[PDB]
């Protein structure tokens, strides 16, 4: 581990996401912003919210720049309008640089903010095409390469805790790593495997076969990344397309079919319990994803285990029983690997080489038996036909 100044930098979880402390303004104002490679624009509150204790005030800064420009975000649920600016921005537990960055001021938003998440922005880390308004809004990242020496690369590490964490434990909890312009050894084993970058919008993908306890899913590769793969801290769960959640579903069902769960459960709306450390992780199967690798013909997969895919939450009884939701939901807008899937491997945005890699996360829980897994290489044909085209 050659970054120690930037290991164990996050708080959080992937319920509510995981965040990075980051400073705007002179003098410098303090902010806990979320990490999301699944968008493109550096937003913080800068206006009182009852779910914000803090927020920018830009007329304090004496560094802030008006862009004289708004800016309208809608999202499926949420919803959040800003002003864009820019400031001097800098991460304290990151590299010891401070570079001017795009702000949008967020002046209103409608359930964008999260209550007891602990953060008050988001640091969208994708690319430009899909910055808002437009792809001439620079990200973040963008500008912090191109004012600095910051080698053009960050990696994550997203440790869940495996258990629930009450309001007091997730702010005293290590929530894992964001390594800025490197790739720290100690927060992994294994080797690192890379997947091609499809495409720099989205940090996309390409899936070349599925797996459920070694068990071919069997259906024609471009569903599983119709119409599109991605991977993003900002999005929970594992999302797979509607025929690719169904098949999915059908299999993991089966597989667990020694105990029958409700409805709910498989929708992700209902949490099981079971007694005190009784969880039956072994009647659960084993997933693998399998990815292009950067070799012609060769692939590689990571595989996740149910406590991975099982999102640890607290009882409405706050009994002593272990409870989980189901973190797998079905997309219509294509597969999404989220936060929960993440957590089993250290995940490097080598955005220079146009790659990314996946290593087993030296933070991922697991039991005696049975362990996360990134292997290869496979002999895969045709992968470039798993590559949906609209
Ligand atoms: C593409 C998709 C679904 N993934 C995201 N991380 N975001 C951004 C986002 C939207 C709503 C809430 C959050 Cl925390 C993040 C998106 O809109």
Redesign the pocket.
């Known amino acids: 581990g050659s970054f120690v100044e930037m290991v164990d930098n996050l708080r959080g979880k992937s319920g509510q ?1 995981y965040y990075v402390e980051m400073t705007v303004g002179s003098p410098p104002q303090t902010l806990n912003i ?1 990490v ?1 490679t ?2 493109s624009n550096f937003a913080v509150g800068a206006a009182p919210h009852p779910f914000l204790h803090r927020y920018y005030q830009r007329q304090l800064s004496s560094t802030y720049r008006d862009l004289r420009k708004g800016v309208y975000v809608p ?4 919803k959040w309008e800003g002003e864009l600016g820019t400031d001097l921005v800098s991460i304290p537990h990151g590299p010891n640089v401070t570079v001017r960055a795009n702000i949008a001021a967020i002046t209103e938003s409608d359930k ?1 903010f999260i209550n007891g998440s602990n953060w008050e922005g ?1 640091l969208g880390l994708a690319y430009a095409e899909i910055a808002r308004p437009d792809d001439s809004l620079e990200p973040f990242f963008d500008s912090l390469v191109k004012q600095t020496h910051v080698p053009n690369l960050f990696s994550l590490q997203l440790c869940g805790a495996g258990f629930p964490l009450n309001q007091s434990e997730v702010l005293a909890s290590v929530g894992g790593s964001m390594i800025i312009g490197g790739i720290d050894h100690s927060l992994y084993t294994g080797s690192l495997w890379y997947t091609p970058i499809r495409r720099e919008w ?1 940090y996309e993908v390409i899936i070349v076969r599925v797996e459920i306890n070694g068990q071919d899913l069997k259906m024609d590769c471009k569903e599983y990344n119709y119409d599109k793969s991605i991977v ?4 929970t769960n594992l999302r797979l397309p509607k025929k690719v959640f169904e098949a999915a579903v059908k299999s993991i069902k089966a597989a667990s079919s020694t105990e029958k769960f409700p409805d709910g459960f498989w929708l992700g709306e209902q949490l099981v319990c079971w007694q005190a450390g009784t969880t039956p992780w072994n009647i659960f199967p084993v997933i693998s994803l399998y990815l292009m690798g950067e070799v012609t013909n060769q692939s590689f997969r990571i595989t996740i285990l149910p406590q991975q895919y099982l999102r640890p939450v607290e009882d409405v009884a706050t009994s002593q029983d272990d409870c989980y939701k189901f973190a797998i939901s079905q997309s219509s ?1 294509g597969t ?1 690997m989220g936060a929960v899937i993440m957590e089993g491997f250290y995940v490097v945005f080598d955005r220079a080489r146009k790659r990314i890699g996946f290593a087993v996360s030296a933070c991922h829980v697991h039991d005696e038996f049975r362990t996360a897994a990134v292997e290869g290489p496979f002999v895969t044909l045709d992968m470039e036909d798993c590559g949906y085209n609209i």
């Open positions: 996401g979320l999301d699944g968008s999202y499926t649920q949420g964008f988001i989205y993003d801290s900002g999005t807008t999404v």
